[PDB]
Every structure is written in structure tokens, then in C-alpha cells.
Amino acid sequence: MPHAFKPGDLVFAKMKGYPHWPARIDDIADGAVKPPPNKYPIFFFGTHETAFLGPKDLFPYDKCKDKYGKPNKRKGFNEGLWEIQNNPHASY
């Protein structure tokens, strides 16, 4: 049975106007800005940007990669596909 999301979990994250995007739950470094309540820091592969999202916009990467893990014309998406598959926990 599923657990709550935790840092390091791999997802597709959905933002308005963007396709479901390869991303990870980030950790929060000591002394760094914390997310709002019930939000997670979402690191988007490829663009390397961070947004604060709730679980309603987070889809498990392994379950959904057949549906969402296809190349996309949007800037950074295909680099992001490489990152989530080949080095998803690296320092970016």
C-alpha cells in the first residue's frame, strides 16, 4: 500500500499550461526556504526549476512513464527525460 511522498521520490508533476513533467521530490537544505503547508518542493528535471506542489499534481514516475515519458517539444523536457531515467538523484 502507498506511503506519503518523501524526498527522492520520482514523479511526473503537472503544472498549468505544461505537460506532465519528469521531476523529483527535493529535500530542503539546512537554512533554505521551506514550502507552504501540505506542499512539497518539486525539482523539475531538464529546466532544473523548483515549484511547490501538492499531491494532486504528483503522479508516480514508474506507474505513469508509459503514458507521460514520451519526447515533448517543450524546452528542457527531453533533457529531463534523460535525467529522471539515468541520474535522478544527482546534484544539479
Swiss-Prot record:
It comes from the Eukaryota. Widely expressed. High expression is found in heart, skeletal muscle, ovary and testis. Overexpression is frequently observed in hepatocellular carcinoma samples. Residues 7-64 form the PWWP domain. It is found in: Nucleus; Cytoplasm. Acts as an epigenetic regulator of myogenesis in cooperation with DPF3a (isoform 2 of DPF3/BAF45C). Associates with the BAF complex via its interaction with DPF3a and HDGFL2-DPF3a activate myogenic genes by increasing chromatin accessibility through recruitment of SMARCA4/BRG1/BAF190A (ATPase subunit of the BAF complex) to myogenic gene promoters. Promotes the repair of DNA double-strand breaks (DSBs) through the homologous recombination pathway by facilitating the recruitment of the DNA endonuclease RBBP8 to the DSBs. Interacts with HDGF. Interacts with trimethylated 'Lys-36' of histone H3 (H3K36me3). Interacts with trimethylated 'Lys-79' of histone H3 (H3K79me3), but has higher affinity for H3K36me3. Interacts with IWS1. Interacts with H2AX, POGZ, RBBP8 and CBX1. Interacts with histones H3K9me3, H3K27me3 and H3K36me2. Interacts with DPF3a (isoform 2 of DPF3/BAF45C). Interacts with SMARCA4/BRG1/BAF190A, SMARCC1/BAF155 and SMARCD1/BAF60A in a DPF3a-dependent manner. Belongs to the HDGF family. This is Hepatoma-derived growth factor-related protein 2.
